Amino acid sequence: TARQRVWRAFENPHTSTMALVFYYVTGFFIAVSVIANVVETVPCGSSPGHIKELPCGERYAVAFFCLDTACVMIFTVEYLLRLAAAPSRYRFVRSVMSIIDVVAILPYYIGLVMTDNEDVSGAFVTLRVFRVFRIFKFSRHSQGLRILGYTLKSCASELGFLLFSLTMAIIIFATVMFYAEKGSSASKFTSIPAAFWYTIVTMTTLGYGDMVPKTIAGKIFGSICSLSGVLVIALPVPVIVSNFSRIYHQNQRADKRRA
Amino acid sequence: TARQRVWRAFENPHTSTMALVFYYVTGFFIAVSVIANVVETVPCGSSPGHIKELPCGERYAVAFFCLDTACVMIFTVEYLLRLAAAPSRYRFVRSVMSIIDVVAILPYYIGLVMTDNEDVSGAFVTLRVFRVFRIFKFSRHSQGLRILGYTLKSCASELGFLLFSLTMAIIIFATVMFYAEKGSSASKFTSIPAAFWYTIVTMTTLGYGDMVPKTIAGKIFGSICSLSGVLVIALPVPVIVSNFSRIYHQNQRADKRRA
Amino acid sequence: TARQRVWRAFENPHTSTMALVFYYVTGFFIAVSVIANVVETVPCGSSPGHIKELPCGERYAVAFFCLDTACVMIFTVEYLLRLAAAPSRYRFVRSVMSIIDVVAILPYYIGLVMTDNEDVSGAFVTLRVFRVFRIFKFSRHSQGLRILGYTLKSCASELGFLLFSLTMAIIIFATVMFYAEKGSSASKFTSIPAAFWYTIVTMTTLGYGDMVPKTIAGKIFGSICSLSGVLVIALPVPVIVSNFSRIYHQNQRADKRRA
Amino acid sequence: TARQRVWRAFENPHTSTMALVFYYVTGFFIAVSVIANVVETVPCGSSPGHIKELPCGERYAVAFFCLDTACVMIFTVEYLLRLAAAPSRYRFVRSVMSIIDVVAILPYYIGLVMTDNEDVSGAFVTLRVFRVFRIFKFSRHSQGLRILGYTLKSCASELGFLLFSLTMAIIIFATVMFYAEKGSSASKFTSIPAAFWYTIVTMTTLGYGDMVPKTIAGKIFGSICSLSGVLVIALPVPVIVSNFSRIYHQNQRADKRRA
Amino acid sequence: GIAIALLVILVICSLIVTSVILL
Amino acid sequence: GIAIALLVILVICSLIVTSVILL
Amino acid sequence: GIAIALLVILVICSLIVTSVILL
Amino acid sequence: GIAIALLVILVICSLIVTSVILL
Ligand SMILES: [K+]
Ligand SMILES: [K+]
Ligand SMILES: [K+]
Ligand SMILES: [K+]
Known part of the structure; x- marks a missing residue:
């Protein structure tokens, strides 16, 4: 034993x-x-x-x-x-x-x-x-770390859709940004994969500034990209926060029940 | 048949x-x-x-x-x-x-x-x-993509007001920024439409840094612009997130009812 | 008549x-x-x-x-x-x-x-x-514009506390940033009011990059400033969004009642 | 007396x-x-x-x-x-x-x-x-300042987990960023503690741009870092906002009860 | 309502144009 | 369902490859 | 309450000013 | 519990230090 x-x-x-x-x-x-x-x-x-x-x-x-x-x-x-x-x-x-x-x-x-x-x-x-x-x-x-793991597992479908819709938006906006900006002088937008970096930096509202559009079409589609990225990233955040709080509260119900 | x-x-x-x-x-x-x-x-x-x-x-x-x-x-x-x-x-x-x-x-x-x-x-x-x-x-x-389409159609009035109030704030702040910054040396603020780019980059909190104010009035109104943009963009986000979750939950009620 | x-x-x-x-x-x-x-x-x-x-x-x-x-x-x-x-x-x-x-x-x-x-x-x-x-x-x-005015008037105390706590945090962090960064070579942090600009750009998560700390203490307090600004700005946003939705819903209750 | x-x-x-x-x-x-x-x-x-x-x-x-x-x-x-x-x-x-x-x-x-x-x-x-x-x-x-103190004390465990998980994510992403970027020409990523600054600037979505990755692996892990930082920082914000509103509402219940 | 407003708008725009052409 | 789709995909990919090689 | 506080504030400010002028 | 863990930690740290000094 x-x-x-x-x-x-x-x-x-x-x-x-x-x-x-x-x-x-x-x-x-x-x-x-x-x-x-x-x-x-x-x-x-x-x-x-x-x-x-x-x-x-x-x-x-x-x-x-x-x-x-x-x-x-x-x-x-x-x-x-x-x-x-x-x-x-x-x-x-x-x-x-x-x-x-x-x-x-x-x-x-x-x-x-x-x-x-x-x-x-x-x-x-x-x-x-x-x-x-x-x-x-x-x-x-850390109990919070385990709870974070549980909520990430709980929100697997929403995280999967986050990845998928983020990939879709990145591809769309990088295509548009590349074709709007490829003709600029000393353009950093040398391919659509190169424009992936600009698109992801704009969508998260990082805005490093190492890649910036110089054409009017570039400015317009960069603005739209920033707003669309805000929406796409905001879609699963309430779900993740709510599930984290729910799992924490269930844990503390169990703790107060058994003690 | x-x-x-x-x-x-x-x-x-x-x-x-x-x-x-x-x-x-x-x-x-x-x-x-x-x-x-x-x-x-x-x-x-x-x-x-x-x-x-x-x-x-x-x-x-x-x-x-x-x-x-x-x-x-x-x-x-x-x-x-x-x-x-x-x-x-x-x-x-x-x-x-x-x-x-x-x-x-x-x-x-x-x-x-x-x-x-x-x-x-x-x-x-x-x-x-x-x-x-x-x-x-x-x-x-993708069912999530269709649900996103349904919620964008469902939130059409809130998206319309987002576009309208965003346009209003962009025009107001670009006017103020242009008149505060046009006299600076080598100023990028060469017109109100030129200041549109700065205003939209500030309102979304991108902050590329390619356009930045140099005068005190410019700094003050840029700060106010960033906060106002946060408010304007935050207005429809809870509605969109709530409707997305509502449509997803209705879909999963229908799925569990019929199966 | x-x-x-x-x-x-x-x-x-x-x-x-x-x-x-x-x-x-x-x-x-x-x-x-x-x-x-x-x-x-x-x-x-x-x-x-x-x-x-x-x-x-x-x-x-x-x-x-x-x-x-x-x-x-x-x-x-x-x-x-x-x-x-x-x-x-x-x-x-x-x-x-x-x-x-x-x-x-x-x-x-x-x-x-x-x-x-x-x-x-x-x-x-x-x-x-x-x-x-x-x-x-x-x-x-625009009915949405009038509703926005009504909710800003409704949330006057929360907006006042936003202004006050934002001013407090700006002063505190600009003081700390100025004293951490004034000794740097070609320092942009030439006074506490000069550091106001850095502090407000960091608190809103704009991050233009025109002002950045170069010392370790500067980096630490800039990071803390960004997080504290996120908290301070997030305090009144749910109230404003909730009141906007409440006023809109009351308007649409009145509209459906009288028609 | x-x-x-x-x-x-x-x-x-x-x-x-x-x-x-x-x-x-x-x-x-x-x-x-x-x-x-x-x-x-x-x-x-x-x-x-x-x-x-x-x-x-x-x-x-x-x-x-x-x-x-x-x-x-x-x-x-x-x-x-x-x-x-x-x-x-x-x-x-x-x-x-x-x-x-x-x-x-x-x-x-x-x-x-x-x-x-x-x-x-x-x-x-x-x-x-x-x-x-x-x-x-x-x-x-200021009554709002006292209420903010009360809610920070009330949310002590969530703030502690914020600090801990933020430290964990900073260490992980700075390690990965340093090893992805140390070989670049004139690399700012000269150590993992040096990459701490980049990681914290990316996680909060500041994006100063003073430190930016130049390698493909750097871009990928910087994007993941920005998203993960958004999640980690968003975890305690609803709790803090909710407790602030709860304490304010309890104060105003007491005020209307005694007057 | 829309048609009369459009007619008035066109009249006023024409008056603005004629004022510009005069000066 | 998956197997037949994979078979059709391979057939069509082979036809694309042969068309490329021809031209 | 406001008036007496303002009066005291002005008195103390005057004393600060006179101290500065002296030194 | 804390005291015994601290004692074990100090013992293991001393062993690490002696290993380093040896090599
Ligand atoms: K930025
Ligand atoms: K920047
Ligand atoms: K940001
Ligand atoms: K930013």
């Missing part, structure tokens, strides 16, 4: 002292890993005799590797314990938290296997980027 | 196998046409001995013409079959889907008739732009 | 034929005046032997003056007839529509009195700007 | 004449102090023989010091009277209004103690910045 005891500790950290210390230790090392991954890219100043300033992760490669190894070992022991204490192991493995944990730990081991290709870009940059998904292990510590 | 059978197949694709294959074939070729129209503007690299990179549609004019011809022939046979199987043919022809289909197919035939003027701009660019409205044939495949 | 008949015609244009023709004539000349005031600032091309392109209003000063005179005479005869047929003349004169009409007609007569100072700026530009308030005479033709 | 009389006057300014005059005097000098603190940074023109224009606060250091001394003495006498007339003095001292008053008055006395370090930056700039929190003494004059 020790397996179910360990599982109960893992699922309910606040029931047991050992569960709670495990909870806090893992949360602390998630924060440590995230901060280290950010900090290792910061220029640490020019080293003695160095041509240029070196990133902290390059100047202290051993220290950052040791910190990464400690965090990854903690995450791996955590995941292996969760797998060991799972009632239905396959059901655990296919759960979203398990996918998050596996995505968090895999890049370290892949980078070990591909240490010869560490200098080679492409894969190195991909592993570096995938290291940032360890921040999703905070979903086990 | 074959006419009503074909019509029932066309209106309800999922009832029959032939209707469903026709549905999927037409949807696939709509997507193909849209993608090809986007891709033909992409620079395909400098051709052997070419001075500059050539757009894919110019380097492979025959291939893109063949793809366009296939898509347009499919759309035309589809439209002719729908016209043949329509109970009230004139009622079909005046429907919105029929107008969409006709707008989708006409530019191809007009461009055939005006093949001598294909090099000549103006009409060529207009036909190229009108080719992007084939994406509206997805309204036959 | 002719006075009350004329008043009833003026208040209800659709009851009588003469009232309706008066309504449409005045609306047409409001639109004509607004369009002419916009167009007279457009460069009309370089005149024969002219050094630079001349604005339409300068190239055709006689024509634009005649159009302005016709519109102003129509507006003045309209206003005098309304004053003559008013039951309580003083109550009419102090009404908002009367103030709009007087503001619409006065600049013409003042410009006649100050024809010697027409070349002199300051007053000339002020009269030119005040001519754009003739567009507010459309409130007699 | 004079202590409770003075306290009742202070808590309810409108009950007594002396309380009301004290109320208006303090409000006037709050406004005076705020305006003076803004104005002292404005360049007052080049002084006779001066190399450059001098800020008003430097050209008239004695006058501004006297105005500051008068305002601070009024605030200090006010605070000391409130402390004297408080029923539970310690409960008063720990209240939010008392903290605001102490933060308002302390920088003056600290600057007196550190008059030798007035030329020295760092502390001088900090005291100058802390002088702007005297504007929070208007919370005693």
Whole structure:
């Protein structure tokens, strides 16, 4: 019956002292890993005799590797314990938290296997980027994060229509903008895919200004694009906000009922 | 009774196998046409001995013409079959889907008739732009798109007032901005219509920054313009969102009632 | 009893034929005046032997003056007839529509009195700007415009708090931004009032980019300023939208009750 | 019983004449102090023989010091009277209004103690910045300001989740943006913390344009960042607006009940 | 109602045009 | 339904390709 | 209430002005 | 619960530091 005891500790950290210390230790090392991954890219100043300033992760490669190894070992022991204490192991493995944990730990081991290709870009940059998904292990510590996941899953059809109608509007407005603006002098609107960038920046009302229309037709269709983007993006926002509040309120009804 | 059978197949694709294959074939070729129209503007690299990179549609004019011809022939046979199987043919022809289909197919035939003027701009660019409205044939495949059409028709008075009050605010603020900013050095505010562009960019909170006031009065009235634009644009958004949700919920009440 | 008949015609244009023709004539000349005031600032091309392109209003000063005179005479005869047929003349004169009409007609007569100072700026530009308030005479033709006036009057306390809290936030963030950014090289943040412009552009999420922070403290407080501005501006928007919808719905309840 | 009389006057300014005059005097000098603190940074023109224009606060250091001394003495006498007339003095001292008053008055006395370090930056700039929190003494004059404080306290958990999820999204998108954009020529994306600025400007839809992606991956992830920021920021806004309206309506129910 | 308003509008526009042509 | 549509799509795509290769 | 507050405000402003003029 | 977690955190941090110092 020790397996179910360990599982109960893992699922309910606040029931047991050992569960709670495990909870806090893992949360602390998630924060440590995230901060280290950010900090290792910061220029640490020019080293003695160095041509240029070196990133902290390059100047202290051993220290950052040791910190990464400690965090990854903690995450791996955590995941292996969760797998060991799972009632239905396959059901655990296919759960979203398990996918998050596996995505968090895999890049370290892949980078070990591909240490010869560490200098080679492409894969190195991909592993570096995938290291940032360890921040999703905070979903086990944040109830709001889990509620956000539940509401995104709940609003799947509205998000799908958001993607579809946004794609439609982007294509339409980029076509019109490209044909209105391609003849301008030194035009940034060099193709319809190039005009995708302008269209998405206009629809969200970012307005970077790196791409701007210069013709009258360009101005007219850019204005219409901004308004249409406002409408398209506003369509699913009330649904998402309402479902988030609904799930939060259901959680707090359950909490006050059982306590 | 074959006419009503074909019509029932066309209106309800999922009832029959032939209707469903026709549905999927037409949807696939709509997507193909849209993608090809986007891709033909992409620079395909400098051709052997070419001075500059050539757009894919110019380097492979025959291939893109063949793809366009296939898509347009499919759309035309589809439209002719729908016209043949329509109970009230004139009622079909005046429907919105029929107008969409006709707008989708006409530019191809007009461009055939005006093949001598294909090099000549103006009409060529207009036909190229009108080719992007084939994406509206997805309204036959997307229920959300039809619901969006229904809610835009439902909110016609609020959209009309949006256009009217937006025009009023644009004129007022462009007048004030032009008179506040016309005296600045190298002023972009060269007329009230020129200030229309600044005013619409400020009202939507785009803020490209290509036009910015330099005088104190300009700053004050630009700030007021941004806030007033926020108010004017926010007036019809709740109505549109509410009607979209209402129409979606009515559709899903009908769906659960009949099934 | 002719006075009350004329008043009833003026208040209800659709009851009588003469009232309706008066309504449409005045609306047409409001639109004509607004369009002419916009167009007279457009460069009309370089005149024969002219050094630079001349604005339409300068190239055709006689024509634009005649159009302005016709519109102003129509507006003045309209206003005098309304004053003559008013039951309580003083109550009419102090009404908002009367103030709009007087503001619409006065600049013409003042410009006649100050024809010697027409070349002199300051007053000339002020009269030119005040001519754009003739567009507010459309409130007699637009029910949505009157409803917007009613809801702005209804939400007076919330708009007052919007102004007050916006002023407070602008002052606070401009102070912080100025002290964070004044030491930068070629800093645009040359005083707290100079930082007002940055703060208002950031709070509304315009983001022109003409003023941007360069220091870390500047970035932090600019981010906080953008979020705080979003909150402050969002506070009264639901109230205004709700009251607009409420007044519209009450109007349509009254319309369906009496008809 | 004079202590409770003075306290009742202070808590309810409108009950007594002396309380009301004290109320208006303090409000006037709050406004005076705020305006003076803004104005002292404005360049007052080049002084006779001066190399450059001098800020008003430097050209008239004695006058501004006297105005500051008068305002601070009024605030200090006010605070000391409130402390004297408080029923539970310690409960008063720990209240939010008392903290605001102490933060308002302390920088003056600290600057007196550190008059030798007035030329020295760092502390001088900090005291100058802390002088702007005297504007929070208007919370005693504005009911909307107190209601805003109550709703911010009421929505503490939602604001905490806003901060947490905003931090998470900023870190994720800045990591992705930095790795997508670090290889660009003259890239502003020199580290993940450098990309924090781009990410926060994109998420709020400011779009300054000082940092913009140049690679395709950069454009894609910038677009996704803008949409995700819209969602994250929109999550708590309805809650805050609803609680503000609820607290206002409860206040007006109480006001109409007792009067 | 529309027709009479249009007639009056045309008359007034013609008078404006003749005034412009005169001056 | 999906399989027959996919078969027809492949047939039509092959015909387009052969038309392109011919011209 | 307003009048007495205004009177006190003017008195204090005059005292500030005299202090400035003295220094 | 907090105290034991903090103790474990300090132990693991010390082990990381010693590993870094060794290499
Ligand atoms: K912008
Ligand atoms: K910008
Ligand atoms: K924006
Ligand atoms: K913007």
